From Swiss-Prot, chains A, B, C, D:
The name this protein goes by in its record: Transthyretin
Gene: TTR
Tissue: Detected in serum and cerebrospinal fluid (at protein level). Highly expressed in choroid plexus epithelial cells. Detected in retina pigment epithelium and liver.
Disease: Amyloidosis, hereditary systemic 1: A form of hereditary systemic amyloidosis, a disorder characterized by amyloid deposition in multiple tissues resulting in a wide clinical spectrum. AMYLD1 is an autosomal dominant form due to transthyretin amyloid deposition. Protein fibrils can form in different tissues leading to amyloid polyneuropathies, amyloidotic cardiomyopathy, carpal tunnel syndrome, systemic senile amyloidosis. The disease includes leptomeningeal amyloidosis that is characterized by primary involvement of the central nervous system.
Source organism of this protein record: Homo sapiens (Human)
Impact after mutating F24C: In a patient with amyloidosis
């Protein structure tokens, strides 16, 4: 998959399961166009968001619904979401893994980019 | 000072100096209204963004211009910016520090909320 | 595998390849006994450190040779290693993934523990 | 103050208060000699560990007692402690801040080295 998202829970030491993820692409008019969406699996992974064909060059935003995740576990967290904004495919097709590590008042995000 | 931002550079082991920071408040129509901005100091800090009176409950977004930071150091970055989105809640402690730790392909952010 | 180690490089956005890892186990005399060792692969993974049989209860230390990694890439980093110390298998056998995200002046480590 | 330690709690969004911290210096025989210790303050900080005169070049280990911290909050932790091992180098900046961000199954540490 050219775009994969992995989410971990730093309180439980577990994959973050059933986390909603929305991907947008910046349009020529500077608005955010919906691009793809999905939910993390039992492994905390979300595959199959897009295809080589559809994932063209652009500025992408990956919005991870961390507040819905924490509220479903009965926790009141700080952030509304984790937002990951990046230019993709500027020098040709690449494969992107966007990882997020979640705590109720903190998160980390890392990109692994492969050719 | 209800709202302060601290930025650290994980590659050099230093405060992240002269980083542009923009704070937005979400409007009733779901747009982002500019609210406050500035540049981190020699200590990596940005104070004086707002006042108790101005900083009402609401959804806020803090955009840290990480890409320009890494460009000025001659280092190739992944993200356009770091985005921190949160609801201000008067029920909790009154002083918010939004910390960010920057690497070229990764960042973390933490909210330190104190009285 | 009951014990796996994954290492990422937050400067390159890549797996951290050929990273030496040493695992120790605390002996009844309080010294650190060598337990297993290995090197991360092209994927940044290290499997096959141990077996269900050998990985009994105890206090384990996973030492990741981050300074050798950075020096091989021509970089002078801050830490000597990343050290991950934990009690394992206290309530029966579990599978542990120890992840580390490396920058020259910073690192993160996460444990994913599965039954 | 050549050596200062700052600890943050990612679950509560707060300084990590009353955390025990032990600093060791590596001896010629490869053992760890106690060097300095204390408990983080209400701000999560530990100042006054050493002096310019005492803090000579050498390999140091900072052990942060994360397990006792999480136990006192009634939260189940993974790590025994957080370990930060580094060489002090007079060629670089003179003030070292060792920051740590704590979650139950994850931590990060960063060195902020300034003049």
């Amino acid at each position: 998959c050219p775009l994969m998202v992995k989410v971990l829970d730093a309180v439980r030491g577990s994959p973050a399961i059933n986390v909603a993820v929305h991907v947008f692409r910046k349009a020529a008019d500077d608005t955010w166009e919906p691009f793809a969406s999905g939910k993390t699996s039992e492994s905390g992974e979300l595959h199959g968001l897009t295809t080589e064909e559809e994932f063209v060059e652009g500025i992408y935003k990956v919005e991870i619904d961390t507040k819905s995740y924490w509220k479903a576990l009965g926790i009141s967290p700080f952030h509304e979401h984790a937002e990951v904004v990046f230019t993709a495919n500027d020098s040709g097709p690449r494969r992107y893994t966007i990882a997020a590590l979640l705590s109720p008042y903190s998160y980390s995000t890392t990109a692994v980019v492969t050719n």
